[PDB]
RNA sequence: UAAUGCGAUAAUACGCAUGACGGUUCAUUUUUGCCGUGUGUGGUCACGGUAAAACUUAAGAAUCGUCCA
């Protein structure tokens, strides 16, 4: 019962590693050509930012997950992006990824699974 | 808060016993050493006054309550032997890990086992079939035939009168059977050999 | 193609098929401008930006043997025909594909229309030069 | 040449491809001790004419006997050959048997017309491929091996040869 | 010394014409394409010389031998292209007739490491307590794997069985290890020789 | 209904079976130190000494000293920066475990290397090295002025300005300047200390 | 793809750490056999296929072991 594939110009991707969570937004013109990444934010950047001002425990923390979502929201707003489609895979079910997605929806970004 | 929230054995294993085992049995990697994973407590119908292989759950509530007092965590009914039988079980079980596992071991060894008449040592470990992960594990099995030695079943004796016996299993991960015996000795549990 | 998550979803989500490789092989197998014209005529309806970009480099390769004589007539005819596809796909090229288009058409000493060059330059003018990183 | 259409070259449903047994070149496995089946087979299953691979050699012994032609041998023939070899070589000889009759064959009694279904099992057979090695010997000398070869040759319908390990 | 002739680039189907003439196709592996021009070399060797080598050494015994190959022109026998030092690897032989089809050889300098399956030989088998009693020595592994240098390849392994009784087993650990070679694999404690009385229960 | 398993026996290698027919010569401490210093890129420095047999206390000191020279002399990209961070993190941790086995020269070099490198200092590596060298007998018996010069320069950069230690170093530094040994480092240390005294 | 991977509190701040040896798992179409179609007095014929089955020597990658020759 796999559903047919649907092409979308803007998609949101997550890469969950042992140490960090990476989020990217990529624009596509056709499935046969490479995309262009427009946003590239990971918990590594948030950790370097918050640690200077507010001490955090580690990159994989609730404070950094919310910070990553906030930074993603600013970049999309500046580039006039308001709706994205999430690419579902094994890493999409990680607890850290799910926290980031929830924060993005509350901030105002419309994320669609289908 | 006048509550028991710590674990004596937990401190002993990691801060005292672990280094001694390393000296006795050198290994290339730090994590390569004896470890106690879990302890399982089981009560079956054959260890109770009831004489039947399959019994209703309402008849096993008392034994489930007994395990809760002994362990401090709720127990669960065993799965039915077949799909046809649904409301009947064949015993109760409970599994412990971490601090709760260590506390149970401390109380059992220090107070209950010495007061059991026919105790000489725990049997030798048995090696199980490795699972999909390819890890070899050894199990040490023994039983407690006098459950009325705990100081907790005295508040309502008439309720806990039918409690007779219990079975205990311990799972150990180690490189060889000799290492398992070394860990058991460190736990102050004499081994029958 | 693979479904394993990774650090570069941009270059991992690309769809590669056997049919595309079949056409690319035919272009490379062509040994003369006359042969290459027939290959493109057969595949008129099945040409994509990747095929157009590779064809321009093929003209550069084919003219290397004609070291002495000027650009042959069939090469000029091919260059004009390809430019019709460049205009159609002007907004559907990658930075790598645009890179090899200009080299191919420049090697035949051909001049691209100023309006088309402006559109193709948007690859490096848009997105504040992000696409430059993708280029090797 | 391969007999298929253009849609088949691209979207064939035969994902798991197995070479048919009649033309597969893989050597047959060593005989086992499983009981004979009671399921009727088709006549092709008892015949196979493709030659053996060009790397076949002796596996256990120093001497052996091979078949230069294809054939279909019955269970009765194998028993007679086994007794002849055992008697000819010695009691103190090492023998490997690489063949066994396992494919059932049916037959109908006299006075029965054509039709009304397939018959019942009558005996068992085994296919032999050209160049296949049938028996191996050890703890014997070369002259003894030649005597065994000459003893059994009149009892078989196919030409036989000698194989030596070196 | 073996004589080989150069060939043209042809299809598989043209090989039978060489055998009919009296030559066997051969391939020599293990060259550097940058400095030699090919990674492999295709030639043909006369059948008369090929059969003599197999008979003298054996199908598997010859794989532990070093041979010299001289490449000459087929039309002019006096034109010598060069010389090569090689060792046989494998032989393709018809099952029905036992005729050579294809020879695989490896370029084997004197300073290269090669994996060789060396045959096992027995010495003083007649004079043994087990044989006298009525037993026999059974060989379970005719060939054993070794890693040898080009300059030192053991023609065979000599195992002495003069002091073996019934039920005596010789394992890989007990095999001699000549100078310049080492045993391959990890499956030690494997039976190689066994002095017994069983005859397979046939 | 519970099956049991038998662990296969181990396979001990037979004796007199060489582990390799290749030529792998033995390496001593001196050869390893020379190999570590003769490195041009962070990748070569990373692979100059690996394994618990070669990655000893002396190797860790050499890596830190050479890393400082390469960092000062060259500019690196993101990938090489990550390699440098890995080198620093591993070398210090090894030093924190085998510090007591270090020699006088190694400790002097370690202080100098730590001062130059910009990464966060490990737990108390500098303080521990100072304590071992605080007996005041090792600096006096340090025949090689290089070790004394490195120690004096390192402390000046770190701003320790220990009254007792500096008082001992002053006459040694002046003697080295008179003898023309390690003039650059000795002059640098003396100038920095003189500036501190003025301030 | 070192913002990697793995872990026996398993969580990730801490532990192992990217080299080197050893053992496992993955080019003249390697070139022979074999198979398919056409033709055929049953083979002194032609072309193609084997990423369907047997068969060569490498080089690399992924684990694993290891005070390292």
DSSP for B128-171 reads: BPP-TT----EEEEEEES-GGGSTTTTTTHHHHTT---EEEEEE
Residue with tokens 């050494």: E57
- Residue (of C59, C63, C20) closest to C37 by Cα position: C59
For residue E144, give the 3-state DSSP assignment.
strand
Cβ–Cβ gap E181/F21 under 8 Å? yes
E172: which chain F residues are within 8 Å (Cβ-Cβ)? 14
Whether residue E95 lies within 8 A of chain D, CB to CB, comes out as yes
Cβ–Cβ gap C9/A26 under 8 Å? yes
Report the residue from A15, A33, A35 with minimal CB separation from C6.
A15
DSSP designation for E158 = E
Q: Where does residue C110 rank: exposed (0-12), middle (13-18), buried (19+ CB within 10 A)?
A: middle
How many C-beta atoms lie closer than 10 Å to residue B72's C-beta?
13
- Residue (of A113, A110, A36, A40) closest to A75 by Cα position: A40
Q: If residue E132 lies in a helix (H) or strand (E), which one and from where to where?
A: helix E129-133
The contacts of residue F143 (CB under 8 Å, 6+ apart) are: none
Whether residue F1 lies within 8 A of chain B, CB to CB, comes out as no
Burial track B75-99 (b if 16+ CB lie within 10 A, e otherwise): beebeeeeeeeeebbbbbbbbbeee
Whether residue D5 lies within 8 A of chain E, CB to CB, comes out as no
Taking the C1' atom of every nucleotide in all shown strands and the CA of E94, the nearest one is G33
DSSP designation for E142 = S
Cβ–Cβ gap B127/F3 under 8 Å? no
Neighbours of chain B (3+ CB pairs under 8 A): F
User: How long is chain B?
Assistant: 193
For A56, C11, C88, D1, E7, the CA distances from C75, given in Å and listed in that order, are 65, 33, 21, 38, 41
Neighbours of chain A (3+ CB pairs under 8 A): C
Please answer whether residues F55 and F32 qualify as being in contact, where contact means their C-beta atoms are separated by less than 8 angstroms: no
For residue F54, give the 3-state DSSP assignment.
coil
Q: How far is C16 from chain A (nearest CA, A)?
A: 7
Rounded to an integer, what distance in angstroms lies between the CA atom of residue E41 and that of residue E9? 11
Q: Where does residue C97 rank: exposed (0-12), middle (13-18), buried (19+ CB within 10 A)?
A: buried
User: How long is chain D?
Assistant: 166
3-state secondary structure chain A: CCCCCCCCCEEEEEEECCCCEEEEEEECCCCCCCCEEEEEEEHHHHHHHHHHHCCCCCCCCHHHHHHHHHHHHHHHHHCCCCEEEECCCHHHHCHHHHHHHHHHHHHCCEEECC
Please answer whether residues B34 and B182 qualify as being in contact, where contact means their C-beta atoms are separated by less than 8 angstroms: yes
Cβ–Cβ gap E96/D68 under 8 Å? yes
* Cα dihedral D130/D131/D135/D136 (nearest 10): -170
Whether residue E93 lies within 8 A of chain D, CB to CB, comes out as yes
Looking from the CA of F91 toward its CB, the CA atoms found within 13 Å total: 29
Cβ–Cβ gap D54/E61 under 8 Å? no
DSSP for F92-150 reads: HHHHTTSGGG--HHHHHHHHHHHHH--SPP-SSHHHHHHHHGGGSSHHHH---HHHHHH
Sign of CA dihedral D132, D134, D136, D141: negative
DSSP designation for B191 = B
- Residue (of B149, B69, B162) closest to B109 by Cα position: B149
State both tokens at F105. Answer: 């020269």
State both tokens at D163. Answer: 């194989």
The contacts of residue D34 (CB under 8 Å, 6+ apart) are: none
E142: which chain D residues are within 8 Å (Cβ-Cβ)? 165
Header resolution in angstroms: 3.2
Neighbours of chain D (3+ CB pairs under 8 A): E
State both tokens at F107. Answer: 């400790």
As a rounded value in angstroms, the CA-to-C1' distance for A46 and G11 is: 21
Please indicate whether chains F and E are in contact, defined as at least 3 beta carbon pairs under 8 Å: yes
Of A9, A32, A40, A89, which to mutate for an interface test with C (greatest number of C Cβ within 10 Å)? A32
Report the residue from C13, C48, C91 with minimal CB separation from A35.
C13
E157-160 β-sheet, strand order = E157-160, E113-123, E143-149, E181-183
D87: which chain E residues are within 8 Å (Cβ-Cβ)? none
Q: If residue E42 lies in a helix (H) or strand (E), which one and from where to where?
A: strand E40-46
Find residues 66-105 of chain A whose CB sits inside 8 Å of chain C. 87, 89-91
A87: which chain C residues are within 8 Å (Cβ-Cβ)? 9
B76-77 β-sheet, strand order = B76-77, B91-96, B35-44, B166-173, B138-144, B126-127
Query: What is the experimental method?
Result: cryo-EM
Cβ–Cβ gap E101/D52 under 8 Å? no
Of D54, D92, D94, which to mutate for an interface test with E (greatest number of E Cβ within 10 Å)? D54
β B76-77/B91-96 pair status? antiparallel
């Amino acid at each position: 019962p796999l559903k047919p594939l649907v092409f979308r110009p803007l998609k949101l991707f997550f890469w969950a590693t042992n140490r960090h969570v990476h989020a990217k937004v990529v624009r596509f013109s056709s499935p046969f050509n490479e995309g262009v990444p427009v946003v590239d934010i990971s918990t590594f950047d948030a950790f370097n930012k918050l640690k200077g001002s507010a001490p955090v425990v580690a990159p994989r923390s609730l404070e950094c997950y919310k910070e990553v979502a906030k930074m993603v929201k600013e970049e999309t707003a500046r580039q006039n992006i308001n709706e994205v489609t999430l690419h579902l895979n094994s890493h999409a079910s990680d607890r850290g990824v799910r926290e980031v997605v929830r924060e993005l929806k509350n901030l105002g970004l419309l994320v669609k699974k289908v | 808060s006048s509550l028991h929230l710590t674990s004596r054995y937990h401190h002993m294993f990691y801060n005292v016993l672990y280094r001694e085992m390393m000296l006795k049995a050198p290994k290339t990697k730090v994590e390569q050493g004896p470890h106690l994973e879990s302890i399982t407590l089981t009560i079956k119908t054959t260890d109770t006054r009831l004489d039947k292989d399959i019994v209703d759950k309402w008849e096993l509530l008392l034994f489930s309550l007994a395990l809760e007092h002994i362990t401090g965590e709720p127990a669960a009914f065993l799965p039915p032997p077949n799909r046809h039988v649904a409301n009947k079980s064949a015993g109760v079980t409970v599994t412990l890990k971490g601090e709760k596992m260590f506390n149970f071991l401390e109380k059992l060894v220090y107070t209950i086992l010495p007061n059991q008449t026919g105790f000489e040592g725990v049997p030798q470990p048995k090696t199980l079939v490795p699972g999909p992960d390819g890890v070899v594990k050894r199990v040490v099995d023994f039983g407690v035939t006098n459950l009325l030695l705990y100081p907790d079943f005295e508040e309502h004796f008439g309720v806990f009168e039918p409690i007779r016996s219990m079975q205990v299993r311990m799972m150990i991960r180690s490189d060889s059977d000799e290492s398992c015996n070394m860990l058991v000795s460190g736990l102050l549990v004499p081994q029958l050999e | 193609n693979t479904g394993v998550p990774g650090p570069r979803p941009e270059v991992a989500q690309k769809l590669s098929t056997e049919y595309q490789g079949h056409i690319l092989r035919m272009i490379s197998l062509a040994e003369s401008a006359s042969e290459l014209d027939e290959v493109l005529w057969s595949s008129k309806k099945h040409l994509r930006p990747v095929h157009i970009a590779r064809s321009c480099l093929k003209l550069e390769y084919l003219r290397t043997k004609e070291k002495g004589r000027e650009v042959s007539e069939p090469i000029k005819n091919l260059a004009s025909e390809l430019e019709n596809y460049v205009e159609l796909y002007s907004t559907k090229f990658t930075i790598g594909q645009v890179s090899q288009l200009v080299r191919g058409l420049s090697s035949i000493r051909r001049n691209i229309q100023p309006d088309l060059l402006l559109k193709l330059a948007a690859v490096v003018v848009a997105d504040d030069g992000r696409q430059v990183q993708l280029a090797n | 040449f391969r007999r298929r259409t253009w849609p088949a070259v691209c979207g064939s449903l035969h994902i798991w491809k197995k070479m048919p047994w009649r033309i597969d070149q893989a050597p047959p496995p060593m005989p086992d001790s499983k009981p004979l089946t009671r399921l009727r087979a088709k006549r092709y299953e008892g015949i196979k004419k493709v030659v053996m691979p060009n790397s076949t050699q002796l596996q256990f012994g120093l001497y052996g006997i091979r078949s230069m032609e294809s054939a279909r041998l019955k269970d009765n023939t194998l028993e007679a050959i086994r007794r002849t070899i055992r008697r000819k070589i010695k009691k103190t000889g090492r023998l490997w048997i690489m063949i066994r009759a396992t494919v059932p064959m049916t037959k109908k009694p006299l006075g029965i017309r054509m039709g009304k279904g397939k018959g019942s099992i009558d005996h068992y057979v085994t296919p032999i491929r050209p160049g296949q090695i049938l028996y191996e010997f050890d703890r014997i000398s070369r002259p003894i091996a030649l005597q065994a070869l000459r003893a059994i040759q009149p009892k078989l319908p196919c030409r036989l040869g000698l194989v030596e390990w070196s | 010394e073996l004589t080989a002739y150069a060939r043209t680039k042809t299809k598989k189907s043209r090989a039978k014409y060489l055998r009919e003439d009296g030559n066997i196709p051969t391939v020599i592996h293990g060259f550097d394409k940058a400095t030699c021009g090919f990674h492999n070399l295709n030639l043909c060797i006369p059948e008369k010389e090929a059969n003599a080598m197999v008979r003298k050494y054996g199908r598997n015994g010859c794989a532990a031998r070093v041979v010299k190959v001289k490449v000459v022109d087929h039309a002019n026998p006096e034109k010598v292209f060069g010389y090569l030092r090689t060792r046989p690897c494998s032989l393709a032989i018809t099952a029905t007739s036992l005729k050579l089809e294809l020879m695989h050889l490896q370029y084997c300098p004197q300073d290269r490491l090669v994996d060789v399956r060396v045959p096992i030989r027995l010495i003083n088998d007649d004079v043994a307590p087990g044989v006298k009693k009525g037993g026999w020595i059974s060989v379970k592994q005719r060939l054993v794997g070794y890693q040898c240098r080009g300059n030192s390849i053991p023609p065979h392994i000599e195992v002495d069985a003069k002091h073996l009784r019934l039920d005596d087993k010789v394992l890989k650990r007990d095999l001699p290890i000549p100078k310049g070679t080492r045993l391959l694999g990890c499956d030690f404690d494997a039976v190689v020789l066994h002095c017994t009385t069983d005859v397979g229960k046939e | 209904i519970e099956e049991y398993y038998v662990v296969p026996p181990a396979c001990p290698p037979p004796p007199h079976n060489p582990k390799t027919l290749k030529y792998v010569p033995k390496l001593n401490r001196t050869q390893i130190i020379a190999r570590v210093y003769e490195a041009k890129t962070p990748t070569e420095l990373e692979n100059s000494a690996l394994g618990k047999k070669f990655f000893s206390e002396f190797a860790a000191v050499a890596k830190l000293v050479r890393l400082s020279q390469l960092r000062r002399a060259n500019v690196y990209n993101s990938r090489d920066d990550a390699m440098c961070v890995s080198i620093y993190n591993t070398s210090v941790r090894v030093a924190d475990k085998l510090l007591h086995l270090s020699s006088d020269e190694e400790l002097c070099g370690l202080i100098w290397a730590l001062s130059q490198l910009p990464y966060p200092e490990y737990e108390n590596l500098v303080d521990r090295s100072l304590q071992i060298l605080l007996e005041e007998d090792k600096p006096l018996k340090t025949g090689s002025s290089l070790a004394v010069s490195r120690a004096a320069a390192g402390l000046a950069s770190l701003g320790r300005w220990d009254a007792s230690t500096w008082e001992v170093l002053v006459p040694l530094l002046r003697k080295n300047v008179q003898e023309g040994k390690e003039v650059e480092l000795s002059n640098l240390a003396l100038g920095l200390y003189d500036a501190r005294e003025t301030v």
